[PDB]
């Protein structure tokens, strides 16, 4: 009997995965759409306005100025760290290049799961605490759910050591991978960077084409909401095949490849190690 | 990745029988599993469904409380254990499997890849 609110499908997984069914559920931004900018409905307001906790990733995800997250919690009356708390902290943090924006941070860090990890645990550790004498089980679901990711975070981790350095290359179209790297030993190559930037011009195109005529993936990958033309010539016009898709922007709907946090990543992680191990 | 049913035929009320979905293709280690049964006049009903993740969910109330679904990855075989058994459950059933995931589709989906089901009824099961 407590209402919660995951600004997002990724946090109302891991979410999910803490409370098995003992709490109630909202999850604002919706599968395909981007946590990064939405507006919010009459229906987000009321159940915001009605929580008892609230959780989102913020880092320059959804905690800045025009933030549909931000107007939702003032025009609904919150406040920090009693009605919402954020998530993406502790995490070994990629503060974005930004040179227009010269001292922000780059949101995607549940793309490892070194740092997904944490997020579990800081959405559970403010969930227990407010929900004491029907915990009991919370503990166990959070044990479990990171052991599973941990498990897999080490299998992935020797999946990349042992293909290449000179193969292992992410290549993507939005440079969202960034932390997939650091977990991975493997760095991305991307078309365009993360929301500072214009997406798919010839500057942006024959950089990443250079880079692929110089060191030598088996494969180039896609993301899940993305529009594939601008990848597609970059493995058409000069390349080697593009190999599966990718997934950032949000957890796929039941029974299709990604439908929760870990199997997300799964598919990423054998997907990826795939395409360059071939 | 190709499924049988193996499991078991009908039971008195009160019975127990476990269903055994196996695979004779290639690993069901990344698929998620769901039973459904579909009876002799009714629609499907997803029974229960275990995930990627070894993550369990159970779809349909008048079931809850007594279905049980769970793996073993030596075997790729998932089981479905049936717990105190009553006359509204004889249907056919049967499992499915669907890629790199957690959850199971509606009952009304097109599935994916179903085994040839198992027809399982509750009776008197003897002269």
């Known amino acids: ?101 010269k001292g922000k941070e780059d949101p995607h860090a549940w793309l490892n799961l070194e740092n997904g990890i944490i997020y579990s645990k800081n959405i559970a550790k403010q969930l227990i605490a407010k929900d004491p004498k029907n915990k009991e089980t919370y503990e166990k679901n959070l044990k479990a759910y990171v052991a599973k990711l941990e498990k897999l975070d080490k299998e992935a981790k020797s999946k990349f050591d042992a293909i290449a350095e000179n193969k292992k290359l992410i290549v993507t179209s939005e440079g969202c991978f960034k932390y997939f790297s650091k977990a991975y030993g493997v760095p991305s190559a991307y078309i365009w960077e993360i929301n500072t930037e214009e997406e798919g011009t010839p500057d942006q195109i024959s950089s990443l084409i250079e880079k692929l005529k110089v060191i030598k993936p088996s494969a180039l990958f896609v993301e899940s909401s993305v529009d594939r033309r601008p990848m597609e010539t970059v493995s058409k016009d000069s390349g080697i095949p593009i190999y599966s898709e990718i997934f950032t922007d949000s957890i796929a709907k039941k029974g299709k490849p990604g439908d929760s946090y870990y199997a997300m990543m799964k598919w990423n992680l054998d997907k990826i190690s795939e395409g360059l191990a071939k | ?85 009553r006359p509204e459950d004889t249907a056919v059933y049967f499992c499915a499997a669907f890629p790199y995931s957690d959850y199971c589709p509606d009952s009304d989906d097109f599935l994916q890849h179903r085994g040839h089901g198992t027809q399982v009824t509750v009776s008197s099961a003897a002269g």
Not at chain 1, 9 to 19: L, Q, R, V, Y
Not at chain 1, 45 to 52: F, L, M, R
Request: glycine share 10%.
């Open chain 1, 1 to 101: 009997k407590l209402k919660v609110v995951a600004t997002n499908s990724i946090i109302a997984d891991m979410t999910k995965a803490i409370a098995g069914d003992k709490i109630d559920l909202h999850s604002i931004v919706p599968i395909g759409q981007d946590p990064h900018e939405y507006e919010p409905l009459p229906e987000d307001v009321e159940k915001t306005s009605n929580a008892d906790v609230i959780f989102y990733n913020g880092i320059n995800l959804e905690d800045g100025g025009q933030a549909w997250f931000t107007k939702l919690v003032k025009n609904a009356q919150k406040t920090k760290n009693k009605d919402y708390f954020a998530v993406s902290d502790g995490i070994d943090v990629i503060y974005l290049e930004g040179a227009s924006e």
């Open chain 2, 1 to 85: 990745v190709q499924l049988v049913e193996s499991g078991g035929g009908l039971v008195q009320p009160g019975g127990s029988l476990r269903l055994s979905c196996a695979a004779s293709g290639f690993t069901l280690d990344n698929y998620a599993i769901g039973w459904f049964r579909q009876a002799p006049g009714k629609e499907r009903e997803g029974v229960s469904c275990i995930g990627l993740s070894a993550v369990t969910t159970y779809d349909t109330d008048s079931v809850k409380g007594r279905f049980t679904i769970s793996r073993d990855s030596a075997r790729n075989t998932v089981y479905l254990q049936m717990n105190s058994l």
